Coordinates of C-alpha atoms and ligand atoms in Angstrom, one line a residue:
Chain A
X1 CA -21.2 -65.9 29.0
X2 CA -23.2 -68.2 31.4
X3 CA -26.6 -66.8 30.4
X4 CA -29.8 -68.8 30.5
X5 CA -30.3 -70.6 27.1
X6 CA -33.8 -70.6 25.4
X7 CA -34.8 -72.1 21.9
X8 CA -38.0 -70.9 20.1
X9 CA -39.6 -73.5 17.7
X10 CA -42.9 -73.8 15.7
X11 CA -44.3 -74.5 12.2
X12 CA -43.8 -71.7 9.5
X13 CA -46.2 -68.6 10.0
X14 CA -46.6 -69.7 13.7
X15 CA -44.8 -66.3 14.3
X16 CA -41.2 -67.1 15.5
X17 CA -39.5 -64.3 13.5
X18 CA -42.2 -61.8 14.7
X19 CA -41.6 -62.8 18.4
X20 CA -37.7 -62.6 18.0
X21 CA -38.0 -59.2 16.2
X22 CA -40.4 -57.6 18.9
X23 CA -38.7 -58.9 22.0
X24 CA -34.9 -59.0 21.3
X25 CA -34.2 -56.7 18.2
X26 CA -36.5 -54.0 19.7
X27 CA -38.7 -53.5 16.5
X28 CA -42.5 -52.7 16.1
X29 CA -45.0 -55.6 15.5
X30 CA -46.5 -54.4 12.2
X31 CA -43.0 -54.3 10.3
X32 CA -42.7 -58.2 11.0
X33 CA -45.2 -58.6 8.1
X34 CA -42.0 -58.5 5.9
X35 CA -39.3 -60.9 7.4
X36 CA -25.0 -60.6 22.4
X37 CA -26.8 -57.5 23.8
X38 CA -29.3 -59.2 26.3
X39 CA -28.9 -61.2 29.6
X40 CA -30.6 -64.0 27.6
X41 CA -29.1 -66.3 25.0
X42 CA -32.1 -66.9 22.6
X43 CA -32.3 -68.8 19.2
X44 CA -35.0 -69.7 16.7
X45 CA -34.8 -73.3 15.4
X46 CA -29.1 -83.8 19.3
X47 CA -26.2 -81.7 20.9
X48 CA -28.5 -78.5 20.9
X49 CA -30.8 -79.8 23.7
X50 CA -27.8 -80.8 25.9
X51 CA -27.0 -77.3 27.2
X52 CA -30.4 -75.4 27.0
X53 CA -32.7 -74.4 29.9
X54 CA -36.1 -74.0 28.1
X55 CA -37.8 -74.7 24.8
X56 CA -40.7 -72.4 23.7
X57 CA -42.9 -74.2 21.1
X58 CA -45.2 -71.6 19.4
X59 CA -48.7 -72.3 17.8
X60 CA -50.9 -70.2 15.4
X61 CA -54.3 -70.1 17.2
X62 CA -55.8 -68.0 14.3
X63 CA -55.1 -71.3 12.4
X64 CA -56.1 -75.0 13.0
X65 CA -53.6 -76.5 15.5
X66 CA -54.0 -80.3 15.0
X67 CA -50.9 -80.5 12.8
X68 CA -49.2 -77.9 15.1
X69 CA -50.1 -80.1 18.2
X70 CA -48.4 -83.2 16.7
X71 CA -44.9 -81.6 15.9
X72 CA -45.3 -80.1 19.5
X73 CA -45.7 -83.6 21.0
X74 CA -42.8 -85.1 18.9
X75 CA -40.4 -82.1 19.4
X76 CA -40.8 -82.2 23.2
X77 CA -40.7 -86.1 23.4
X78 CA -37.3 -85.9 21.7
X79 CA -35.8 -82.9 23.8
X80 CA -36.9 -84.6 27.2
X81 CA -34.9 -87.8 26.2
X82 CA -31.7 -85.7 25.9
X83 CA -32.2 -83.3 28.9
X84 CA -35.2 -84.0 31.2
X85 CA -34.4 -80.9 33.4
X86 CA -35.3 -78.6 30.4
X87 CA -38.6 -76.5 30.9
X88 CA -41.3 -76.8 28.1
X89 CA -43.2 -73.6 27.2
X90 CA -46.1 -73.2 24.7
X91 CA -46.9 -69.8 23.1
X92 CA -50.6 -70.1 22.0
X93 CA -49.7 -67.2 19.7
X94 CA -51.7 -64.6 17.7
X95 CA -54.7 -64.5 20.1
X96 CA -55.2 -60.7 19.3
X97 CA -57.3 -61.9 16.3
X98 CA -59.8 -63.9 18.5
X99 CA -62.7 -62.8 20.7
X100 CA -62.4 -63.8 24.4
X101 CA -65.0 -66.7 24.0
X102 CA -62.6 -68.2 21.3
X103 CA -59.3 -67.6 23.3
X104 CA -60.6 -69.5 26.4
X105 CA -62.1 -72.3 24.2
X106 CA -58.8 -72.6 22.2
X107 CA -56.6 -72.6 25.4
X108 CA -58.9 -75.2 27.2
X109 CA -58.6 -77.3 23.9
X110 CA -54.8 -77.0 23.3
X111 CA -54.1 -77.7 27.0
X112 CA -56.5 -80.7 27.0
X113 CA -55.0 -82.6 24.0
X114 CA -51.4 -81.5 24.5
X115 CA -51.6 -83.1 28.0
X116 CA -53.7 -86.0 26.7
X117 CA -51.0 -86.7 23.9
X118 CA -48.4 -86.8 26.8
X119 CA -50.4 -89.3 29.0
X120 CA -50.6 -91.8 26.1
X121 CA -46.7 -91.9 25.6
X122 CA -46.5 -92.5 29.4
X123 CA -44.5 -89.2 29.7
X124 CA -46.2 -88.4 33.0
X125 CA -43.3 -86.5 34.7
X126 CA -42.8 -83.9 31.8
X127 CA -44.4 -80.5 32.7
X128 CA -45.9 -78.2 30.0
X129 CA -46.6 -74.6 30.8
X130 CA -48.9 -72.6 28.4
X131 CA -49.2 -68.9 27.7
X132 CA -51.5 -66.5 25.7
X133 CA -49.1 -64.2 23.7
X134 CA -49.3 -61.5 21.0
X135 CA -46.7 -59.2 19.4
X136 CA -49.5 -56.5 19.5
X137 CA -49.9 -57.0 23.4
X138 CA -47.5 -57.2 26.4
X139 CA -48.4 -60.9 26.8
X140 CA -45.2 -61.9 24.9
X141 CA -43.0 -59.9 27.4
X142 CA -44.9 -61.4 30.5
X143 CA -44.5 -64.9 29.0
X144 CA -40.7 -64.4 28.4
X145 CA -40.3 -62.9 31.9
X146 CA -42.0 -66.0 33.3
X147 CA -39.9 -68.4 31.0
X148 CA -36.6 -66.6 31.9
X149 CA -37.3 -66.3 35.7
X150 CA -37.3 -70.2 35.9
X151 CA -33.7 -70.4 34.6
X152 CA -32.1 -67.9 37.1
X153 CA -30.9 -70.0 40.2
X154 CA -30.0 -66.7 42.0
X155 CA -33.6 -65.4 41.8
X156 CA -34.3 -65.9 45.6
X157 CA -31.1 -63.8 46.3
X158 CA -32.3 -61.1 43.8
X159 CA -35.8 -60.9 45.3
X160 CA -34.3 -60.5 48.8
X161 CA -31.9 -57.8 47.7
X162 CA -34.8 -55.8 46.1
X163 CA -36.9 -56.3 49.3
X164 CA -34.1 -54.9 51.6
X165 CA -33.6 -52.1 49.1
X166 CA -37.2 -51.0 48.7
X167 CA -38.4 -51.5 52.3
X168 CA -35.4 -49.4 53.5
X169 CA -35.9 -46.8 50.7
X170 CA -39.7 -46.0 50.7
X171 CA -40.3 -47.8 47.4
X172 CA -43.6 -49.6 46.5
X173 CA -42.2 -51.8 43.7
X174 CA -38.9 -52.6 42.0
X175 CA -38.2 -54.5 38.7
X176 CA -34.8 -55.8 37.7
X177 CA -35.1 -55.5 33.8
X178 CA -33.1 -56.8 30.9
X179 CA -32.9 -53.5 28.9
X180 CA -33.1 -54.7 25.2
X181 CA -35.8 -57.3 25.8
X182 CA -37.8 -55.4 28.5
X183 CA -38.0 -58.8 30.4
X184 CA -37.9 -58.7 34.2
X185 CA -35.5 -61.2 35.8
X186 CA -36.7 -60.3 39.4
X187 CA -39.0 -58.0 41.4
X188 CA -39.6 -57.4 45.1
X189 CA -42.0 -59.8 47.0
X190 CA -45.1 -57.4 46.7
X191 CA -47.7 -58.7 44.2
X192 CA -47.0 -57.7 40.5
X193 CA -49.8 -55.6 38.8
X194 CA -49.2 -56.5 35.0
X195 CA -50.3 -52.9 34.2
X196 CA -47.3 -51.8 36.4
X197 CA -44.9 -54.0 34.4
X198 CA -46.3 -52.8 31.2
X199 CA -45.9 -49.0 32.1
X200 CA -42.3 -49.8 33.2
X201 CA -41.7 -51.5 29.8
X202 CA -43.1 -48.4 28.0
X203 CA -40.7 -46.2 30.2
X204 CA -37.7 -48.3 29.0
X205 CA -38.8 -47.7 25.4
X206 CA -39.0 -43.9 25.8
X207 CA -35.6 -43.7 27.7
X208 CA -33.8 -45.9 25.1
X209 CA -35.5 -44.2 22.0
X210 CA -34.8 -40.7 23.4
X211 CA -31.2 -41.8 24.2
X212 CA -30.8 -43.2 20.6
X213 CA -31.6 -39.8 19.3
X214 CA -29.6 -37.6 21.8
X215 CA -26.2 -38.2 23.3
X216 CA -24.8 -40.9 21.0
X217 CA -21.7 -38.6 20.7
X218 CA -20.7 -36.3 17.8
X219 CA -19.6 -39.2 15.6
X220 CA -22.4 -41.5 14.0
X221 CA -22.6 -43.5 17.3
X222 CA -21.6 -44.5 20.8
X223 CA -24.2 -46.3 23.0
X224 CA -27.7 -45.2 24.2
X225 CA -27.5 -47.2 27.4
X226 CA -24.3 -46.6 29.6
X227 CA -23.4 -46.4 33.3
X228 CA -25.1 -42.9 33.7
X229 CA -28.4 -43.9 32.0
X230 CA -31.1 -42.6 34.4
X231 CA -34.7 -41.4 34.1
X232 CA -37.3 -39.8 36.4
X233 CA -41.0 -39.8 35.3
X234 CA -43.6 -37.9 37.4
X235 CA -47.3 -38.8 36.8
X236 CA -50.1 -36.3 37.9
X237 CA -51.3 -38.6 40.7
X238 CA -47.8 -38.0 42.3
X239 CA -46.5 -41.4 41.1
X240 CA -42.7 -41.4 40.3
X241 CA -40.9 -43.9 38.0
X242 CA -37.1 -44.1 38.6
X243 CA -34.7 -46.0 36.3
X244 CA -31.0 -46.4 37.2
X245 CA -28.3 -48.5 35.3
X246 CA -27.3 -51.7 37.3
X247 CA -25.2 -53.6 34.7
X248 CA -24.6 -53.3 30.9
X249 CA -27.8 -55.5 30.5
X250 CA -29.7 -54.7 33.8
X251 CA -31.7 -51.5 34.6
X252 CA -33.6 -51.0 37.9
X253 CA -37.1 -49.5 37.6
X254 CA -38.7 -48.2 40.8
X255 CA -42.3 -47.2 41.5
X256 CA -42.9 -44.8 44.4
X257 CA -44.8 -41.7 45.5
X258 CA -43.4 -38.1 45.3
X259 CA -43.6 -38.2 49.1
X260 CA -41.0 -41.1 49.4
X261 CA -39.0 -39.5 46.5
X262 CA -38.4 -36.4 48.7
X263 CA -35.8 -38.8 50.3
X264 CA -33.9 -39.4 47.0
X265 CA -30.6 -39.0 48.9
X266 CA -31.3 -42.2 51.0
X267 CA -32.7 -43.9 47.8
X268 CA -29.5 -42.9 46.0
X269 CA -27.2 -44.2 48.8
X270 CA -29.1 -47.5 49.3
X271 CA -29.2 -47.9 45.5
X272 CA -25.3 -48.1 45.4
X273 CA -25.3 -50.9 48.0
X274 CA -28.0 -52.8 46.0
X275 CA -25.9 -52.3 42.8
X276 CA -22.6 -53.6 44.4
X277 CA -24.5 -56.6 45.8
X278 CA -25.9 -57.4 42.3
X279 CA -22.4 -57.1 40.9
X280 CA -21.3 -59.7 43.6
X281 CA -24.2 -62.0 42.7
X282 CA -23.1 -62.2 39.0
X283 CA -19.3 -61.9 39.7
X284 CA -19.3 -58.9 37.1
Chain B
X1 CA -61.8 -14.0 18.4
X2 CA -59.5 -17.0 17.7
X3 CA -58.7 -17.6 14.0
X4 CA -61.2 -20.3 12.8
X5 CA -59.6 -22.3 9.8
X6 CA -61.4 -24.8 7.6
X7 CA -59.6 -28.1 6.8
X8 CA -61.1 -30.4 4.1
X9 CA -59.9 -34.0 4.8
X10 CA -60.9 -35.9 1.6
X11 CA -60.1 -39.1 -0.4
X12 CA -61.8 -42.4 -1.2
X13 CA -63.5 -44.7 1.4
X14 CA -61.0 -46.8 3.4
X15 CA -58.0 -44.6 2.5
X16 CA -57.6 -43.8 6.2
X17 CA -58.8 -40.3 6.8
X18 CA -60.8 -40.8 10.0
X19 CA -57.9 -43.1 11.3
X20 CA -55.4 -40.2 10.9
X21 CA -57.8 -37.6 12.6
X22 CA -58.5 -40.1 15.4
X23 CA -54.7 -40.8 16.1
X24 CA -53.6 -37.0 15.9
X25 CA -56.6 -35.3 17.7
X26 CA -58.4 -38.1 19.7
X27 CA -55.8 -40.3 21.4
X28 CA -56.4 -43.5 19.4
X29 CA -53.6 -46.0 18.8
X30 CA -53.2 -47.6 15.2
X31 CA -54.7 -50.9 16.4
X32 CA -57.9 -49.1 17.6
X33 CA -58.5 -47.6 14.1
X34 CA -59.5 -51.1 12.8
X35 CA -62.9 -50.5 14.6
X36 CA -63.8 -47.1 12.9
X37 CA -67.0 -47.1 10.9
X38 CA -67.2 -45.6 7.4
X39 CA -67.9 -41.8 7.7
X40 CA -71.4 -40.8 6.3
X41 CA -71.1 -37.4 4.5
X42 CA -69.0 -35.0 6.6
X43 CA -68.0 -35.5 10.2
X44 CA -67.3 -32.0 11.6
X45 CA -64.5 -31.5 14.3
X46 CA -63.5 -28.4 16.2
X47 CA -59.9 -28.6 17.5
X48 CA -58.8 -25.8 20.0
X49 CA -55.1 -25.6 19.1
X50 CA -53.1 -23.1 21.3
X51 CA -56.1 -20.8 22.0
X52 CA -55.2 -18.4 19.1
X53 CA -56.2 -21.1 16.4
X54 CA -59.3 -23.3 15.9
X55 CA -59.2 -26.1 13.3
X56 CA -62.6 -26.7 11.6
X57 CA -61.9 -30.3 10.5
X58 CA -64.2 -31.5 7.6
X59 CA -63.8 -35.3 7.5
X60 CA -65.6 -36.2 4.1
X61 CA -66.7 -39.7 3.5
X62 CA -65.2 -40.9 0.2
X63 CA -68.0 -43.2 -1.0
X64 CA -68.4 -42.3 -4.7
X65 CA -72.0 -41.3 -3.8
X66 CA -70.8 -38.8 -1.1
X67 CA -68.1 -37.3 -3.5
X68 CA -70.7 -36.6 -6.3
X69 CA -72.9 -34.5 -3.8
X70 CA -69.7 -32.6 -2.8
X71 CA -69.1 -31.9 -6.5
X72 CA -72.8 -30.7 -7.0
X73 CA -75.6 -30.0 -4.4
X74 CA -73.1 -29.5 -1.5
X75 CA -70.4 -27.8 -3.8
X76 CA -70.6 -24.3 -2.1
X77 CA -71.0 -25.7 1.5
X78 CA -67.9 -28.0 1.0
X79 CA -65.4 -25.9 -1.1
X80 CA -65.9 -22.3 0.2
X81 CA -63.6 -20.7 2.8
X82 CA -61.0 -23.5 2.6
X83 CA -57.6 -22.8 4.2
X84 CA -56.3 -26.4 3.7
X85 CA -57.3 -29.4 1.6
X86 CA -55.6 -32.6 2.9
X87 CA -56.2 -35.3 0.2
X88 CA -55.5 -39.0 1.2
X89 CA -54.5 -41.7 -1.3
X90 CA -54.3 -45.5 -0.5
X91 CA -50.8 -46.6 -1.8
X92 CA -52.6 -50.0 -2.3
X93 CA -55.5 -48.6 -4.6
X94 CA -56.3 -50.7 -7.7
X95 CA -58.2 -47.6 -9.2
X96 CA -55.3 -45.2 -9.7
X97 CA -57.0 -43.4 -12.7
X98 CA -60.4 -43.2 -10.8
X99 CA -58.4 -42.0 -7.7
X100 CA -56.8 -39.1 -9.8
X101 CA -60.2 -38.3 -11.3
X102 CA -61.7 -37.7 -7.8
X103 CA -58.6 -35.7 -6.7
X104 CA -58.5 -33.4 -9.9
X105 CA -62.3 -32.8 -9.5
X106 CA -61.6 -31.6 -5.9
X107 CA -58.7 -29.4 -7.2
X108 CA -61.1 -27.8 -9.7
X109 CA -63.7 -27.0 -7.0
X110 CA -60.8 -25.6 -5.0
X111 CA -59.6 -23.5 -8.0
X112 CA -63.2 -22.2 -8.5
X113 CA -64.1 -21.6 -4.8
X114 CA -61.0 -21.3 -2.5
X115 CA -58.1 -20.9 -4.9
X116 CA -55.5 -19.9 -2.2
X117 CA -56.2 -23.1 -0.2
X118 CA -52.9 -24.8 0.9
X119 CA -53.1 -28.3 -0.7
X120 CA -51.5 -31.4 0.8
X121 CA -51.4 -34.9 -0.6
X122 CA -50.8 -37.9 1.7
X123 CA -49.7 -41.2 0.1
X124 CA -51.0 -43.4 2.9
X125 CA -50.7 -47.0 4.3
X126 CA -47.0 -46.9 3.3
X127 CA -46.6 -49.8 5.9
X128 CA -48.2 -52.2 3.3
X129 CA -45.2 -51.6 0.9
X130 CA -41.7 -53.3 1.5
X131 CA -39.1 -50.8 3.2
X132 CA -36.7 -50.9 0.2
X133 CA -39.6 -49.8 -2.1
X134 CA -41.2 -46.9 -0.1
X135 CA -38.9 -44.0 -1.2
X136 CA -39.0 -45.1 -4.8
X137 CA -42.9 -45.5 -5.0
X138 CA -43.5 -42.1 -3.1
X139 CA -41.1 -40.1 -5.4
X140 CA -43.0 -41.4 -8.5
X141 CA -46.5 -40.8 -6.9
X142 CA -45.1 -37.3 -5.8
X143 CA -43.9 -36.4 -9.3
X144 CA -47.3 -37.3 -10.9
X145 CA -49.2 -35.5 -8.1
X146 CA -47.2 -32.2 -8.5
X147 CA -47.7 -32.4 -12.4
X148 CA -51.5 -33.3 -12.3
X149 CA -52.1 -30.6 -9.7
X150 CA -52.0 -28.3 -12.7
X151 CA -51.5 -24.6 -11.7
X152 CA -52.0 -25.3 -7.9
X153 CA -48.9 -26.3 -5.8
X154 CA -49.3 -29.4 -3.5
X155 CA -47.0 -30.8 -0.7
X156 CA -46.8 -34.6 -0.6
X157 CA -45.7 -36.9 2.2
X158 CA -45.7 -40.7 2.6
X159 CA -47.6 -41.6 5.8
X160 CA -48.6 -44.6 7.9
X161 CA -50.5 -44.8 11.3
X162 CA -47.8 -47.4 12.3
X163 CA -44.8 -45.0 12.4
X164 CA -43.7 -41.3 12.9
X165 CA -44.3 -40.3 9.2
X166 CA -47.9 -39.5 10.2
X167 CA -46.6 -36.8 12.8
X168 CA -44.1 -35.4 10.1
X169 CA -47.0 -34.7 7.8
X170 CA -49.6 -33.4 10.4
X171 CA -46.8 -31.2 12.0
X172 CA -46.1 -29.6 8.6
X173 CA -49.9 -29.1 7.9
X174 CA -50.6 -27.5 11.3
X175 CA -47.3 -25.4 11.3
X176 CA -48.7 -23.5 8.3
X177 CA -51.9 -22.6 10.2
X178 CA -50.4 -21.3 13.5
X179 CA -50.8 -17.5 13.3
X180 CA -47.7 -15.7 14.6
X181 CA -45.5 -18.8 14.1
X182 CA -42.3 -16.8 13.2
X183 CA -42.6 -14.8 16.5
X184 CA -43.0 -18.1 18.5
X185 CA -39.8 -19.5 16.8
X186 CA -37.8 -16.3 17.8
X187 CA -39.1 -16.3 21.4
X188 CA -38.0 -20.0 21.7
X189 CA -34.6 -19.4 20.0
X190 CA -34.2 -16.6 22.6
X191 CA -35.2 -19.0 25.5
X192 CA -32.9 -21.7 24.1
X193 CA -29.9 -19.4 23.8
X194 CA -30.4 -17.9 27.4
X195 CA -30.5 -21.5 28.8
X196 CA -27.6 -22.7 26.6
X197 CA -29.5 -25.8 25.2
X198 CA -28.2 -28.0 22.3
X199 CA -31.9 -28.2 21.3
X200 CA -35.4 -27.1 22.5
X201 CA -38.6 -28.7 21.0
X202 CA -42.0 -27.0 21.7
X203 CA -45.2 -29.3 21.4
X204 CA -48.9 -28.6 21.4
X205 CA -50.1 -30.4 24.6
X206 CA -53.0 -32.6 23.3
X207 CA -51.6 -33.8 19.9
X208 CA -47.8 -33.6 20.7
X209 CA -47.2 -32.1 17.3
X210 CA -43.9 -30.1 17.1
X211 CA -45.0 -26.4 16.7
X212 CA -41.5 -24.8 17.0
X213 CA -37.8 -25.8 17.6
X214 CA -34.3 -24.5 17.9
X215 CA -31.0 -26.4 17.4
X216 CA -27.5 -25.3 18.3
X217 CA -25.1 -27.9 16.9
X218 CA -26.7 -29.4 13.6
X219 CA -27.9 -33.0 14.6
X220 CA -27.7 -36.2 12.4
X221 CA -31.3 -37.5 12.5
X222 CA -33.4 -34.9 10.4
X223 CA -36.5 -37.1 11.2
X224 CA -36.0 -36.8 15.0
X225 CA -38.9 -34.2 15.6
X226 CA -41.6 -36.7 14.4
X227 CA -40.0 -39.6 16.3
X228 CA -40.1 -37.6 19.6
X229 CA -43.8 -36.6 18.9
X230 CA -44.6 -40.3 18.4
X231 CA -42.4 -41.8 21.3
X232 CA -43.9 -39.3 23.8
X233 CA -47.6 -39.4 22.5
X234 CA -47.4 -43.2 22.8
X235 CA -46.0 -43.1 26.4
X236 CA -48.6 -40.4 27.4
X237 CA -51.3 -42.9 26.3
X238 CA -49.7 -45.8 28.2
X239 CA -49.8 -43.5 31.4
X240 CA -53.5 -42.4 31.3
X241 CA -54.6 -46.1 30.5
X242 CA -52.3 -48.0 33.0
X243 CA -51.8 -45.4 35.9
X244 CA -52.4 -41.6 35.6
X245 CA -51.5 -38.7 33.2
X246 CA -47.8 -38.0 32.3
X247 CA -46.6 -34.8 34.1
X248 CA -42.8 -34.6 33.3
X249 CA -39.7 -36.6 32.4
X250 CA -35.9 -36.3 33.0
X251 CA -33.6 -38.6 30.9
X252 CA -29.7 -38.7 31.0
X253 CA -26.7 -40.5 29.5
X254 CA -22.9 -39.8 30.0
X255 CA -23.4 -37.7 26.7
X256 CA -26.7 -35.7 27.4
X257 CA -29.7 -34.7 29.6
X258 CA -33.2 -34.1 28.4
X259 CA -36.1 -32.5 30.3
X260 CA -39.8 -32.8 29.1
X261 CA -42.3 -30.7 31.1
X262 CA -45.6 -28.7 30.7
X263 CA -44.7 -25.2 29.5
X264 CA -47.9 -23.1 29.0
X265 CA -51.5 -24.3 29.5
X266 CA -51.4 -25.4 25.8
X267 CA -47.8 -26.7 25.3
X268 CA -45.1 -29.1 26.4
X269 CA -41.3 -28.2 26.1
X270 CA -38.4 -30.6 25.7
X271 CA -34.9 -29.2 26.6
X272 CA -31.7 -31.1 25.4
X273 CA -28.4 -30.2 27.3
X274 CA -24.9 -31.6 26.9
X275 CA -23.8 -30.8 30.6
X276 CA -21.4 -27.8 30.5
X277 CA -20.9 -26.2 34.0
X278 CA -24.8 -26.1 34.3
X279 CA -26.0 -27.0 37.9
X280 CA -29.3 -28.8 37.1
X281 CA -31.2 -26.1 39.3
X282 CA -30.3 -23.2 36.9
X283 CA -32.0 -25.0 34.0
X284 CA -35.2 -26.0 35.9
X285 CA -35.4 -22.4 37.3
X286 CA -35.2 -21.0 33.7
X287 CA -37.9 -23.5 32.4
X288 CA -40.2 -22.4 35.4
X289 CA -39.6 -18.7 34.9
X290 CA -39.9 -18.5 31.0
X291 CA -43.5 -19.9 31.4
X292 CA -45.1 -16.5 32.1
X293 CA -43.3 -14.9 29.1
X294 CA -44.9 -17.6 26.8
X295 CA -48.1 -17.9 28.9
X296 CA -49.1 -14.6 27.4
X297 CA -49.0 -14.6 23.5
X298 CA -51.9 -17.1 22.8
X299 CA -54.6 -14.8 24.4
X300 CA -58.0 -13.8 22.8
Ligands
GTP401 N1 -52.1 -50.7 7.1 C1 -52.7 -49.6 7.4 N2 -54.1 -49.6 7.6 C2 -54.5 -48.3 7.8 C3 -53.8 -47.1 7.8 N3 -54.6 -46.0 8.0 C4 -55.8 -46.6 8.2 N4 -55.8 -47.9 8.0 C5 -57.0 -48.8 8.1 O1 -57.9 -48.5 7.0 C6 -59.2 -48.8 7.5 C7 -60.1 -47.7 7.0 O2 -59.8 -46.4 7.7 P1 -60.8 -45.2 7.9 O3 -60.0 -44.2 8.7 O4 -62.1 -45.7 8.4 O5 -61.1 -44.7 6.4 P2 -61.8 -43.4 5.8 O6 -60.8 -42.9 4.8 O7 -62.3 -42.5 6.8 O8 -63.1 -44.0 5.0 P3 -64.5 -43.3 4.8 O9 -65.0 -42.7 6.1 O10 -65.5 -44.3 4.2 O11 -64.2 -42.1 3.9 C8 -59.1 -49.0 9.0 O12 -59.1 -50.4 9.2 C9 -57.8 -48.5 9.4 O13 -57.2 -49.0 10.5 C10 -52.4 -47.1 7.6 O14 -51.6 -46.2 7.6 N5 -52.0 -48.4 7.4
GDP402 N1 -52.2 -60.9 14.0 C1 -51.0 -61.4 14.4 N2 -50.1 -61.7 13.4 C2 -48.9 -62.2 13.8 C3 -48.5 -62.4 15.2 N3 -47.3 -63.0 15.2 C4 -46.9 -63.1 13.9 N4 -47.9 -62.6 13.1 C5 -47.9 -62.5 11.6 O1 -47.9 -63.9 11.0 C6 -46.9 -64.0 10.1 C7 -45.9 -64.9 10.9 O2 -44.6 -64.4 10.7 P1 -43.4 -65.3 11.0 O3 -42.7 -64.7 12.3 O4 -42.5 -65.2 9.8 O5 -43.7 -66.8 11.4 P2 -42.3 -67.7 11.4 O6 -42.5 -68.2 9.9 O7 -42.3 -68.9 12.3 O8 -41.1 -66.8 11.4 C8 -46.6 -62.6 9.7 O9 -47.6 -62.1 8.9 C9 -46.8 -61.8 11.0 O10 -47.2 -60.5 10.8 C10 -49.5 -62.1 16.2 O11 -49.3 -62.2 17.4 N5 -50.7 -61.6 15.7
MG403 MG1 -64.0 -42.0 7.9

């Protein structure tokens, strides 16, 4: 029940419903043209700003943003008054319709004025972070992963547990994922290749979608993801992807070589120490 | 000495013929089809499917000007030797009557030149209609298409590049063109029963079209074959782009296990199990061994 709390905001047609649909109700981007199950407590949108961790203001960059930029300044100016520990996030959204010249121009511009408008009100000590997002890209997932990692006080502990696990288990990279959202709340200390994240997100999709079709039990339904959810994917360059259930919200996805995976037994035994430790972290 | 089979892909400009062909046979994603140029006259494609079948795909530009040549100076070249006509319709067309007039004029040429052609009608871009309207609008378009198809039979599907309905339709089309397809089905029902699987799907390797299946206990999702095609095809494209080629997958729940692996040089297999007293080794040894017994068949 003590999840991180995020509020999405933005003018109509900015793309809020489209972001919500794609990330948290696991639905395709194209079908958003007609519109309790995650580690994250998220809501579209002064008691509300009291107990929230982060506000994501969205902007349509296929559209003029002058009006957009002004509600932004006012919306954040308000929130800061009530709770100045809140983090302020800005989804320069719909950049899949631009060319790269126009994306960089637009970001330089929105970043410039947004930060100018904050100087004028003497709100010096109010950080804005910016992001280029798209329901048609993985940018929305990376942006949410970055937003959520800021609200987990236990992240140093999580990064350390993954480091001990992978270093002792022959593993190149580990991602602690929120399964519905495909957001990563932690990874080991090795640098993150966003192509690696993206492939791991696409693995979660195949595992969950194949699970939703098979083994739901003989009645209409049980649950696709349970304590025995596991997958092994072999790629022709001898890469192995390995997903194991950690909690009802958390799956572990591991990248390693067939050569380390020869030692699955050790991986499997160390995994159960890592899983218990993660249970202790979150008093589950 | 592989069966060569002529497929006319026809319909008006922008209806989405080249998009379909590009997603099924050429590893495009829906988003990429935005960048396709109008086809000029016919774009010829040779698809090696399983080594016993070759698909001679005729992608015909549907510019009025191109159509008129097909109906006259190119009439014999186009409409002779046709196994299949796949005719595409834009659900969103403003020219329904003009659309039907170009369809019926193709049906005539097909009646006069290749009158045993299997005819398919694809009611396409269904993603542009509201969900609660799609079944309604397709049934009506279907009813008209079957009636206006005169003495010829037609099989209709509602398709979109943005979901699994496109694999439903192209699976059905290709299924009817695989030579000894009834044999394949028996050989796989055999294999399935020996290995005591709830379900086995067999896929052509490059397209991930379902080419055979076998189910034990009747399942609830009758659309699940196209969904699996789509889910796996997508993931196979994320692999090659982001890392390297998909080889194999093992997935499990407290209620099931599935195994997706290369089968023959030209196929993938998926095996669904609900964990009786089956040591995982027994199943993998069966998959491994049954290869040689399917590795024959598609010779020439
Ligand atoms: N919404 C939607 N757009 C689609 C669909 N299929 C194709 N399109 C788009 O329609 C446009 C035209 O598609 P093409 O495949 O070039 O059309 P074509 O029928 O080959 O046209 P010609 O070569 O002139 O005969 C492209 O932008 C496609 O992305 C679909 O199912 N839904
Ligand atoms: N091209 C593109 N369109 C988007 C994106 N996000 C949303 N949209 C579209 O823009 C509109 C915005 O939808 P909506 O979520 O209702 O904005 P909201 O009114 O704040 O809920 C819809 O047509 C969506 O298809 C995006 O990243 N790219
Ligand atoms: Mg074309």
